[PDB]
Design a protein around this ligand. Structure first.
Ligand SMILES: [Cl-]
Ligand SMILES: [Cl-]
Ligand SMILES: [Cl-]
Ligand SMILES: [Cl-]
Ligand SMILES: [Cl-]
Ligand SMILES: [Cl-]
Ligand SMILES: [Cl-]
Ligand SMILES: [Cl-]
Ligand code: NA
Ligand code: NA
Lengths: 135, 135
C-alpha cells in the first residue's frame, strides 16, 4: 500500500448533520441541552474520516482512530443543519491526519482534527484477544 | 468568583464505565464494533468534568466545553470496565483545563484533556438566541 497515493492531500468529503436530542444529551449537562456536544462533533468527524479512507483500503485492512481534537467555536442549536467537511491533511507512515470544519448557515461552529492508523483486521482482532487474555 | 479557589489544581473525580454497544457504535465503522470509540471516551470525560466543576459554581453559572483532545492507547473491549480519572490541571481566566486518564485492569486505554469555560446561563441563552435570529 502507498498511502500517499490512496489518500492525496486535500481529498475531502462532506455531510450535513441535523442537530437532534441524541447529539446534545452527550453534553452530560442538562443546562447544555440546546446545542450539539463535543462528542457529537467528534462522532461525525469519525464517520466522515472512515467514509474517506476505508473504501480505499484493500481487503483485510481498515482504519482506527488514534487521536482526535475538537475546538468549539459557536453553538449549533437543536434543529440546526451543520455541514461537516473532513479533509486529508497529511500522511505519515501508516497514518493519515485529517482536518475538520463544521459550519452552519450562520458561520463556523467547530473545527477539529483526527489521526487514524491503517491496520490489518486480523491483527487488530488478535490484539484485542491478547490484551484480555490470561496473565 | 475566584476559580483558583473553587478549583484547586489536582482536584479529581473518578468513575467506572462498562463498555457497551452504545459506546462502540460511535466508532461509525462496523469493523470496530468490539471496542470503545473516541466519542465515548470524550463523552465520559465531559461527564466527569461537569461533575467536578458545576456544583462548585454559584447559582446562574455553568461550564461549557471549548476544546477536547483524546489519545487512544489500547482497545477497551465490550464488557470491559474502564476507570476514568479526570483532574484539574490548571485555571486561566474563566477557564479550567482538566486532564483525563482511562485505565482498565490490563492498563491504560486512553488519555485526554478538556478545556471548559464558566458562563452565565442567561448570557448563554442569549448567545444562542442571537446567533439564530434575523439578519
Ligand atoms: Cl480518534
Ligand atoms: Cl455566536
Ligand atoms: Cl495492524
Ligand atoms: Cl489469568
Ligand atoms: Cl469540549
Ligand atoms: Cl494492547
Ligand atoms: Cl457568559
Ligand atoms: Cl432574516
Ligand atoms: Na438523533
Ligand atoms: Na449503553
Amino acid at each position: 500500500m502507498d498511502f500517499n497515493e490512496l489518500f492525496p492531500v486535500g481529498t475531502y468529503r462532506r455531510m450535513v448533520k441535523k442537530v437532534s436530542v441524541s447529539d446534545t444529551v452527550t453534553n452530560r449537562s442538562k443546562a447544555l441541552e440546546e446545542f450539539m456536544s463535543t462528542a457529537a462533533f467528534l462522532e461525525t468527524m469519525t464517520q466522515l474520516a472512515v467514509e474517506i479512507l476505508d473504501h480505499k483500503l484493500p481487503e483485510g485492512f481498515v482504519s482506527v482512530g488514534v487521536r482526535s481534537e475538537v475546538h468549539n467555536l459557536a453553538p449549533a442549536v437543536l434543529g440546526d443543519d451543520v455541514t461537516f467537511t473532513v479533509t486529508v491533511d497529511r500522511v505519515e507512515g501508516n497514518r493519515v491526519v485529517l482536518s475538520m470544519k463544521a459550519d452552519d448557515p450562520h458561520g463556523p461552529v467547530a473545527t477539529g482534527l483526527q489521526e487514524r492508523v491503517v491496520v490489518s483486521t486480523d491483527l487488530l482482532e488478535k490484539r484485542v484477544w491478547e490484551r484480555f487474555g490470561g496473565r
